[PDB]
């Protein structure tokens, strides 16, 4: 909107109140929008016995199509925007603008792959709060979108050549970060909740759980398949809650034709790490904390007192 001449501003995408605000907003959206038939949340505050809160309510079968949200300045504040096309999200931004609002952000709730988001304008970008810390998530921003077509009939398709090209680009960025002599290896999720072990997302109001092993099973810069990759998926009724610790149960599908196509525009990864003087790095699909999803879009914005 308005470029600030000769201004340097520090950003920290990992400590950004716009992320927290968006998070609470999306939680609220889901309350009024995608109601389960039963929800369970624990309560073990007492000195002994636990007391699970159980709620049973009407659970209408509805469609669910994320719509873009624009965040504008909250009373008393201004939104600053970093214009540097390849900004890692933490540090001095030399080219900063004031804006009325953010661009339109689709609040897609998903694990592992980030869908329908914004692409990097130059090269693929990787962002972490601490790359040296193996327990911190790496946010990947693609510069080219890869299509993923899913169906309630139990599978998602990805073009193998496009995905291969995508992995090579990501691996190049990873070895630029962790050492150019390193072999880069992608492996499946090492375990945890189903929403985290699979590529998990919602399509036509239904929760999909796609086995992503075929997407993350390759070795790069080591030595000197089928047209489409087909991921087997399951739609489920009993879901772990992303909003807070708990479980929700939904009714079975009513549509015999659930189809959607998304653009993969980023990824959430974790590095294995550990004491292993073997020149190679292992990366697995991650996610689960939806604040990371919001950060993948909000990394370039900041709210400040005026």
């Amino acid at each position, epitope marked *: 909107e308005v470029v600030l001449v000769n201004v340097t501003e520090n950003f920290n995408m990992w400590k950004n109140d716009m992320v927290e605000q968006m998070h609470e907003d999306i939680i609220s959206l889901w309350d009024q929008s995608l109601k389960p*038939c*039963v929800k369970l949340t624990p309560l073990c505050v007492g000195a002994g016995s636990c007391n699970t809160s159980v709620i*049973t309510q009407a659970c209408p079968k509805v469609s669910f199509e994320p719509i873009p949200i624009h965040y504008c300045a909250p009373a008393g504040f201004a939104i600053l925007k970093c214009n540097n096309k390849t900004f890692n999200g933490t540090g001095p931004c030399t080219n900063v603008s004031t804006v009325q609002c953010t661009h339109g952000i689709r609040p897609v709730v998903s694990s592992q792959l980030l869908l329908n988001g914004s692409l990097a304008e130059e090269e693929v970008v990787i962002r972490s709060v601490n790359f040296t810390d193996n327990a911190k998530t790496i946010i990947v921003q693609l510069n080219t979108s890869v299509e993923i077509n899913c169906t309630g009939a139990g599978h998602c398709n990805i073009a193998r050549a496009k995905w291969n090209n995508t992995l090579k680009q990501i691996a190049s960025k990873l070895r630029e970060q962790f050492g150019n002599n390193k072999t880069i290896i992608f492996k499946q999720s090492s375990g945890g909740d189903p929403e985290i072990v699979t590529h998990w997302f919602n399509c036509g109001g239904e929760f999909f759980y796609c086995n992503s092993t075929q997407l993350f099973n390759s070795t790069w810069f080591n030595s000197t398949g089928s047209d489409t990759i087909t991921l087997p998926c399951r739609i*489920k*009724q*009993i879901i772990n809650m992303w909003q807070k610790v708990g479980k929700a*149960m939904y*009714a*079975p599908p009513i549509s015999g034709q659930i189809r959607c196509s998304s653009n993969i525009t980023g990824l959430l990864l974790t590095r294995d790490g550990g004491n292993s003087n073997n020149e190679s790095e292992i990366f697995r699909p991650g996610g689960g904390d939806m604040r990371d999803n919001w950060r993948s879009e909000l990394y370039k914005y900041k709210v400040v007192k005026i």
Partner: antibody, heavy 128, light 110 residues
């Protein structure tokens, strides 16, 4: 397929409570939901309530709410019905029934309301 | 409170002939409707669920039809073992408050 074997006949004074049980054998317990249905002599079937075993959540008939509790013991594959503050008109045969819900342990749940498998019934006589 | 009504209360049928049983709901229950058979001293037996789907072990002569608020159980040719009481059951509501009809007694006409 599950076999449902119920506990023996009960005789109670009005004002007492009763706890009847139903042992489920032969399949995976948590993939089933269980329901209790009673039948007064000469009368029809009356739905009392149903427990979603995997969630440990039970729902009850309105006229019964307050004084009925349905529980399940996963470790012994047993379902329980407790009826409190018994009245002479609670005299009935009590049936445990059940139905397969899908791979509940893998988050698949059809929430079926019909009843495929039935216990042999337990007579509960409530009288002075 | 969804009320299920069955008619008639007693149906008299000559052996080997057709029997038609009626179940009506006080409001729509879509296709969430089950039919049971009960003989004296025994537990009910599931014949039909989803209004028209035969349960395993149920002979082809049993047939369920209808949706919404009106349902029919048809037995195309009565065998000796088909004479019993028949109940319908609605399971459409949520929270569940499932209800039964008061039954139709099918007896031998002589």
């Amino acid at each position: 397929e599950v076999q449902l074997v119920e506990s023996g006949a009960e005789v109670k004074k009005p004002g007492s409570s009763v706890k009847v049980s139903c042992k489920a054998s032969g399949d995976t317990f948590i993939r089933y939901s269980f329901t209790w249905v009673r039948q007064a002599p000469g009368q029809g079937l009356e739905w009392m309530g149903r427990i979603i075993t995997i969630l440990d959540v039970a729902h009850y008939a309105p006229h019964l709410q307050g004084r009925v509790t349905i529980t399940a013991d996963k470790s012994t594959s047993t379902v329980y019905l407790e009826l409190r503050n018994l009245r002479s008109d609670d005299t009935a045969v009590y049936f445990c029934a059940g139905v397969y819900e899908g791979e509940a342990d893998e988050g698949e749940y059809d929430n079926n309301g019909f009843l495929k498998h039935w216990g042999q019934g337990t007579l509960v006589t409530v009288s002075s | 409170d969804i009320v299920m009504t069955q008619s008639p209360a007693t149906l008299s049928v000559s052996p080997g002939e057709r029997a038609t049983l009626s179940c009506r709901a006080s409001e729509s229950v879509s296709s969430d409707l089950a039919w049971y058979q009960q003989k004296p001293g025994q537990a009910p037996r599931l014949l039909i669920y989803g209004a028209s789907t035969r349960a395993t072990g149920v002979p082809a002569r049993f047939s369920g039809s209808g949706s919404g608020a009106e349902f029919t159980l048809t037995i195309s040719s009565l065998q000796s073992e088909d004479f019993a009481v028949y109940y319908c059951q609605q399971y459409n509501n949520w929270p569940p408050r499932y209800t039964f009809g008061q039954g139709t007694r099918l007896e031998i006409k002589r």
